[PDB]
Write a protein that binds this ligand. Sequence first.
Ligand SMILES: NC(=O)c1ccc[n+]([C@@H]2O[C@H](COP(=O)([O-])OP(=O)(O)OC[C@H]3O[C@@H](n4cnc5c(N)ncnc54)[C@H](OP(=O)(O)O)[C@@H]3O)[C@@H](O)[C@H]2O)c1
Ligand SMILES: NC(=O)c1ccc[n+]([C@@H]2O[C@H](COP(=O)([O-])OP(=O)(O)OC[C@H]3O[C@@H](n4cnc5c(N)ncnc54)[C@H](OP(=O)(O)O)[C@@H]3O)[C@@H](O)[C@H]2O)c1
Ligand SMILES: O=C(O)C/C=C/c1cccc(C(=O)O)c1C(=O)O
Ligand code: NA
Ligand code: NA
Lengths: 359, 357
Amino acid sequence: GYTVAVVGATGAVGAQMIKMLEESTLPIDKIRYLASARSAGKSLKFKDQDITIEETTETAFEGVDIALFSAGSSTSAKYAPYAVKAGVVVVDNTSYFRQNPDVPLVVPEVNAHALDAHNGIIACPNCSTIQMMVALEPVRQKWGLDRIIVSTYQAVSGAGMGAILETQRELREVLNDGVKPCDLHAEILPSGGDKKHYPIAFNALPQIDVFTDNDYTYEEMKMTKETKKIMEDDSIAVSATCVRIPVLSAHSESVYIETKEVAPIEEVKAAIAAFPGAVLEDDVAHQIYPQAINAVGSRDTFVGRIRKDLDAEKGIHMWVVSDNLLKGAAWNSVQIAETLHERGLVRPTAELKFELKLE
Amino acid sequence: GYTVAVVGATGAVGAQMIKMLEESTLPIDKIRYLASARSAGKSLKFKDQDITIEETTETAFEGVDIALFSAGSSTSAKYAPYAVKAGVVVVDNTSYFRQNPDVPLVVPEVNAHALDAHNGIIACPNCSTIQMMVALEPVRQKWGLDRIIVSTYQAVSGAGMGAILETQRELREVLNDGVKPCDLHAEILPSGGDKKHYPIAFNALPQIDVFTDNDYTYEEMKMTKETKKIMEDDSIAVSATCVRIPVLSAHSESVYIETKEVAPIEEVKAAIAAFPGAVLEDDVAHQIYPQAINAVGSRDTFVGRIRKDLDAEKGIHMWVVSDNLLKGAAWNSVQIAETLHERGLVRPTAELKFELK
Ligand SMILES: NC(=O)c1ccc[n+]([C@@H]2O[C@H](COP(=O)([O-])OP(=O)(O)OC[C@H]3O[C@@H](n4cnc5c(N)ncnc54)[C@H](OP(=O)(O)O)[C@@H]3O)[C@@H](O)[C@H]2O)c1
Ligand SMILES: NC(=O)c1ccc[n+]([C@@H]2O[C@H](COP(=O)([O-])OP(=O)(O)OC[C@H]3O[C@@H](n4cnc5c(N)ncnc54)[C@H](OP(=O)(O)O)[C@@H]3O)[C@@H](O)[C@H]2O)c1
Ligand SMILES: O=C(O)C/C=C/c1cccc(C(=O)O)c1C(=O)O
Ligand code: NA
Ligand code: NA
């Protein structure tokens, strides 16, 4: 069996990493929980066993086969290469390595083939991107993809435990204490690192991550660049608007595409239904469509409201929902680990290709 | 001065109609409040004055100069033609008369000219449509509009007072009693008239109004058809996805357009800023953009996140927010009543064009 390390075990994603590993087929002989100085020393369960949380360091990875990183870009940047040097295979949840040509950016249903040539780090795409890829890959396979326009409806848990607590606190102030939404004090949303913070309670915030110099946010640009890389096709035009709404868990997306060939809607429904990881929830006569609240807890990605555009011959609209901490993060990661095991790819990389940041 | 009736004074829109009328320049000699049998006899303020609510009937409209209807399609269908017969000019917030070619469908900043030839009923468009017209008309004026793709983020007040209360109750159950959202009981959303009801707390429901034969909802199709009539151009391609989110007041819209000619973004910003009823809130260096919670209570429509498509030469994306009960409903209506007064159009109509029911 394997020695598995979860880096960022104590946060929003980490708690789901733990659940997904508890429910995994991976043969696990030993679990180790890593976090920051703040949590180092506390205790947390794996199944019935108590595990002591360790501060993440350059030397914490000795004897580790697999490490799942969900502790923020800076932490992956700093310690993931030292894990690779020590012999680990890393599955990284953060943005840091996603656009690195030496790193497979993987959604196992779509591009598991990219895993074979790994160099010790496999990157998880962004949650919003992952569910979109699960919905669209079956379509792309049969009728091609010319362009995508997407407006997202993103849950606060995407911004971490702190953002969940902040959201809940704000809603309680308004609903129980009669505070006006515009009078609320926010500390984290829309983005913990940006300069100004706004309330999410009864609001919709058209900012996720920070602004880039083209006036799209990094979240929007991630959807653009990550799609191109995952589908191995720079020609696919992708523009996004990424919006936070008062939902704790599960992202929703209004997705527009234009195919290369005309894709009959009833065949699109069938192809999506037949694709692993994607579930068709689309029966308007009984008001059946994906909903954030029903997606929570499921590893599947749900697709519905599938219909042709009223004007564009090759245009198609749909609604895609998935739990952003499961398929959007922890399940994708564990599923990559499982796929690595299946393909005999859990073993040390001889040649280090990633900059060591701590000398 | 005028005698003004508010039909549906007791509901979510009615309450704002009262507010907008209280704050209006319209010379009002007499105010009357009309609702259902079950509100008749109740008292409701107009400023400091106590007004007794009356039941809406076929003969309630004698002496009325202006009637603002926001009592539901069925109520406008039944009584509006009788109001017109009594010599009223009706401003209707409902969908019932919107696609009647004898009925102007008006956003006063966009197509005030359409008021002049009215036959006693003016229709206010759908809330989601109105804010989009305010944002896009100044762009259309300078560079044309070829197509629109919009995804909405719509407040629950759009489905009425009952929906607001249901949403508040749901949220309280999850936050205070630890109910899982998927175990909540619902009775109104997504649509009161449809067969099945679903929770909106911590949800996003991709259904507003009922489904039509083509698998778009009536809300989505109203956005398409109303745009074409307002802008007087059936060639504008319009497709919508309308989604309810857990916000009580103010609709937000992610809008994508393709113009006929390329529109420099700084000029697009300037045009919108200069358009009456539209306010530019767009300074991403300081994270300035429209926000539902900031829009609540304002008559203005706020526009931001304005940017070129990454690939389509003539493509532009933006974010448009407005209070759905003000510009989306009660303010658009009062503003039509004010424009009618300005233009000397508050007078009986000779020709009866609407069948008595
Ligand atoms: N695939 C996706 O789309 C997706 C979705 C969500 C998140 N993510 C990624 O996962 C990261 C964490 O997300 P989250 O929502 O779980 O955040 P979170 O709830 O804020 O938790 C942050 C976690 O990182 C740990 N951490 C912070 N600084 C550290 C350091 N210097 N060394 C070691 N550990 C450190 C924290 O440990 P302490 O308890 O000790 O602070 C905690 O376990 C995000 O920053 C993002 O990069 C990806
Ligand atoms: N009296 C009651 O117990 C009662 C029962 C049901 C609904 N309502 C109204 O509706 C609200 C409940 O939620 P909602 O979402 O349904 O309201 P809403 O959409 O916010 O407003 C509905 C409006 O249409 C009016 N209306 C309904 N039937 C009518 C008729 N036959 N003739 C003239 N006007 C009519 C209502 O007046 P009415 O107040 O006369 O209904 C109300 O002003 C209440 O706040 C109240 O305004 C009242
Ligand atoms: O906000 C969301 O819905 C998803 C958040 C993702 C996220 C948040 C903070 C940092 C990062 C990051 O690693 O840069 C990321 C990410 O792209 O995975
Ligand atoms: Na499937
Ligand atoms: Na094998």
